[PDB]
PDB file of C-alpha atoms in Angstrom:
ATOM      1  CA  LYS A   1      -3.420   6.248   7.821  1.00 31.87           C
ATOM      2  CA  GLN A   2      -0.964   8.819   6.481  1.00 31.69           C
ATOM      3  CA  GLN A   3      -0.617   9.442   2.756  1.00 32.09           C
ATOM      4  CA  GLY A   4      -0.510  12.151   0.060  1.00 32.30           C
ATOM      5  CA  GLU A   5       1.713  13.744  -2.571  1.00 31.33           C
ATOM      6  CA  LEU A   6       5.246  14.842  -1.650  1.00 33.18           C
ATOM      7  CA  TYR A   7       8.263  16.411  -3.327  1.00 38.11           C
ATOM      8  CA  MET A   8      11.497  14.375  -3.482  1.00 39.08           C
ATOM      9  CA  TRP A   9      15.004  15.603  -4.198  1.00 37.94           C
ATOM     10  CA  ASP A  10      16.781  13.939  -7.095  1.00 41.43           C
ATOM     11  CA  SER A  11      20.520  14.534  -6.508  1.00 43.41           C
ATOM     12  CA  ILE A  12      21.079  13.905 -10.215  1.00 43.20           C
ATOM     13  CA  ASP A  13      18.887  16.280 -12.190  1.00 42.22           C
ATOM     14  CA  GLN A  14      19.262  18.675  -9.248  1.00 42.44           C
ATOM     15  CA  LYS A  15      15.475  19.216  -9.231  1.00 42.02           C
ATOM     16  CA  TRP A  16      12.445  18.401  -7.102  1.00 44.78           C
ATOM     17  CA  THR A  17       9.974  15.841  -8.466  1.00 43.90           C
ATOM     18  CA  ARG A  18       6.401  15.033  -7.420  1.00 42.27           C
ATOM     19  CA  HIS A  19       5.721  11.543  -6.026  1.00 41.55           C
ATOM     20  CA  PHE A  20       2.724   9.928  -4.281  1.00 40.20           C
ATOM     21  CA  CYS A  21       3.639   8.451  -0.921  1.00 40.40           C
ATOM     22  CA  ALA A  22       2.103   6.325   1.799  1.00 38.96           C
ATOM     23  CA  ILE A  23       2.909   4.956   5.248  1.00 45.41           C
ATOM     24  CA  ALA A  24       1.884   1.428   6.268  1.00 48.28           C
ATOM     25  CA  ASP A  25       3.392  -0.406   9.225  1.00 50.53           C
ATOM     26  CA  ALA A  26       6.881   0.993   9.453  1.00 53.85           C
ATOM     27  CA  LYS A  27       7.283   1.505   5.749  1.00 48.71           C
ATOM     28  CA  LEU A  28       7.163   4.646   3.531  1.00 49.58           C
ATOM     29  CA  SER A  29       6.467   4.088  -0.160  1.00 49.57           C
ATOM     30  CA  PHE A  30       6.977   6.477  -3.046  1.00 48.28           C
ATOM     31  CA  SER A  31       5.918   6.231  -6.694  1.00 50.63           C
ATOM     32  CA  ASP A  32       7.536   7.489  -9.914  1.00 48.08           C
ATOM     33  CA  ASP A  33       7.397  11.125 -11.045  1.00 51.26           C
ATOM     34  CA  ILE A  34       3.622  11.638 -11.315  1.00 47.77           C
ATOM     35  CA  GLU A  35       4.388  14.393 -13.794  1.00 48.14           C
ATOM     36  CA  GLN A  36       6.227  12.213 -16.291  1.00 48.57           C
ATOM     37  CA  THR A  37       4.815   8.911 -16.075  1.00 47.19           C
ATOM     38  CA  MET A  38       2.352  11.456 -17.522  1.00 44.27           C
ATOM     39  CA  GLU A  39       4.867  13.175 -19.920  1.00 46.60           C
ATOM     40  CA  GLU A  40       5.554   9.762 -21.475  1.00 46.81           C
ATOM     41  CA  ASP A  41       2.132   8.158 -21.239  1.00 51.31           C
ATOM     42  CA  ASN A  42       4.083   5.369 -19.601  1.00 49.57           C
ATOM     43  CA  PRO A  43       2.056   2.628 -17.774  1.00 47.14           C
ATOM     44  CA  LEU A  44       5.012   0.781 -16.343  1.00 46.27           C
ATOM     45  CA  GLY A  45       4.748   4.036 -14.506  1.00 43.70           C
ATOM     46  CA  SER A  46       4.700   2.560 -11.121  1.00 44.21           C
ATOM     47  CA  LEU A  47       2.932   3.345  -7.902  1.00 46.46           C
ATOM     48  CA  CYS A  48       5.783   1.956  -5.850  1.00 48.86           C
ATOM     49  CA  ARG A  49       9.249   2.584  -7.311  1.00 47.61           C
ATOM     50  CA  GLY A  50      10.647   2.299  -3.825  1.00 49.47           C
ATOM     51  CA  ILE A  51       9.954   1.380  -0.185  1.00 46.26           C
ATOM     52  CA  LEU A  52      11.801   2.706   2.845  1.00 47.32           C
ATOM     53  CA  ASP A  53      12.046   1.031   6.260  1.00 49.98           C
ATOM     54  CA  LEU A  54      11.531   3.835   8.718  1.00 48.31           C
ATOM     55  CA  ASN A  55      12.929   1.574  11.421  1.00 45.71           C
ATOM     56  CA  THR A  56      16.322   2.082   9.791  1.00 43.80           C
ATOM     57  CA  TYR A  57      15.951   5.859   9.389  1.00 41.99           C
ATOM     58  CA  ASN A  58      15.514   8.969  11.544  1.00 40.79           C
ATOM     59  CA  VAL A  59      13.656  12.217  10.865  1.00 41.37           C
ATOM     60  CA  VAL A  60      15.183  15.650  11.083  1.00 40.69           C
ATOM     61  CA  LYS A  61      13.471  18.842  10.028  1.00 41.74           C
ATOM     62  CA  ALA A  62      15.395  21.504   8.133  1.00 43.96           C
ATOM     63  CA  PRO A  63      14.669  24.911   9.648  1.00 44.69           C
ATOM     64  CA  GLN A  64      16.293  26.974   6.892  1.00 42.87           C
ATOM     65  CA  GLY A  65      14.726  24.699   4.290  1.00 41.11           C
ATOM     66  CA  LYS A  66      16.701  23.256   1.391  1.00 42.97           C
ATOM     67  CA  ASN A  67      17.195  23.735  -2.340  1.00 43.68           C
ATOM     68  CA  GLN A  68      14.680  26.580  -2.719  1.00 41.66           C
ATOM     69  CA  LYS A  69      11.830  24.698  -0.992  1.00 42.14           C
ATOM     70  CA  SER A  70      10.528  26.178   2.279  1.00 41.36           C
ATOM     71  CA  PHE A  71       9.277  23.137   4.141  1.00 43.06           C
ATOM     72  CA  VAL A  72      11.287  19.943   4.139  1.00 44.41           C
ATOM     73  CA  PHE A  73      12.023  16.949   6.292  1.00 45.04           C
ATOM     74  CA  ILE A  74      14.923  14.550   5.858  1.00 45.29           C
ATOM     75  CA  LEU A  75      15.165  10.800   6.477  1.00 46.73           C
ATOM     76  CA  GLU A  76      18.776  10.245   7.522  1.00 46.81           C
ATOM     77  CA  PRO A  77      19.833   6.632   7.983  1.00 46.02           C
ATOM     78  CA  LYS A  78      21.608   4.336  10.344  1.00 45.11           C
ATOM     79  CA  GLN A  79      23.999   2.263   8.163  1.00 46.20           C
ATOM     80  CA  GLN A  80      26.683   4.664   6.905  1.00 46.48           C
ATOM     81  CA  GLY A  81      27.113   4.849   3.139  1.00 48.05           C
ATOM     82  CA  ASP A  82      23.331   4.984   2.643  1.00 48.60           C
ATOM     83  CA  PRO A  83      22.337   8.499   1.595  1.00 48.24           C
ATOM     84  CA  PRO A  84      19.716  10.791   3.068  1.00 45.68           C
ATOM     85  CA  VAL A  85      16.374  10.879   1.375  1.00 45.53           C
ATOM     86  CA  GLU A  86      15.035  14.421   1.216  1.00 45.35           C
ATOM     87  CA  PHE A  87      11.276  15.167   1.109  1.00 40.96           C
ATOM     88  CA  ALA A  88       9.404  18.481   0.962  1.00 40.62           C
ATOM     89  CA  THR A  89       5.796  19.672   0.956  1.00 41.69           C
ATOM     90  CA  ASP A  90       3.763  22.642  -0.195  1.00 39.87           C
ATOM     91  CA  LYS A  91       2.050  23.954   2.936  1.00 39.59           C
ATOM     92  CA  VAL A  92       3.681  24.182   6.386  1.00 39.82           C
ATOM     93  CA  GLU A  93       0.808  22.317   8.034  1.00 44.05           C
ATOM     94  CA  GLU A  94       1.481  19.229   5.871  1.00 43.96           C
ATOM     95  CA  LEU A  95       5.146  19.216   6.840  1.00 43.71           C
ATOM     96  CA  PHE A  96       4.350  19.047  10.543  1.00 45.35           C
ATOM     97  CA  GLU A  97       1.797  16.309   9.927  1.00 48.18           C
ATOM     98  CA  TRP A  98       4.273  14.020   8.176  1.00 46.30           C
ATOM     99  CA  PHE A  99       7.062  14.776  10.600  1.00 46.24           C
ATOM    100  CA  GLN A 100       4.648  13.759  13.361  1.00 47.31           C
ATOM    101  CA  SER A 101       3.568  10.511  11.716  1.00 46.23           C
ATOM    102  CA  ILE A 102       7.115   9.463  10.919  1.00 49.97           C
ATOM    103  CA  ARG A 103       8.527  10.211  14.367  1.00 50.94           C
ATOM    104  CA  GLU A 104       5.575   8.582  16.091  1.00 51.53           C
ATOM    105  CA  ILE A 105       7.134   5.523  14.431  1.00 49.82           C
ATOM    106  CA  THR A 106      10.879   5.905  14.695  1.00 48.17           C
ATOM    107  CA  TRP A 107      10.614   6.516  18.442  1.00 47.18           C
ATOM    108  CA  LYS A 108       7.932   3.857  18.944  1.00 49.98           C
TER     109      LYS A 108
END
C-alpha cells in the first residue's frame, strides 16, 4: 500500500502546504495542513479533507519542476473545468515511487 506525507499547491495563498496522503483502491486521499491543524490546536483537523478518483485523472511529471519545488507530479483531469491538483515531494526517489503507483492505476 502506498502512503506518506506530500506537499500540495494551494493556488490561493500561493504556497506549498504539507498533507498526509494515501492510496486505496483507485482513490487518493489528503488531509488538512498537518502544520496548522497544529498551529491552531484544532481537532476538527481532519485526516481526510478530500478524496480524488484517480480513474478520472491522469499523471504527468514536471521535468522543470514548479513553484520553487524540484520534484513534482500533477494530476490533470478528464472533465474540463476541473483544475489540476499539484503535488510535490522532498526526495527524488519518493517522486518516482508515487508516479509509479498512480500510473500503475490510471493505465490499469
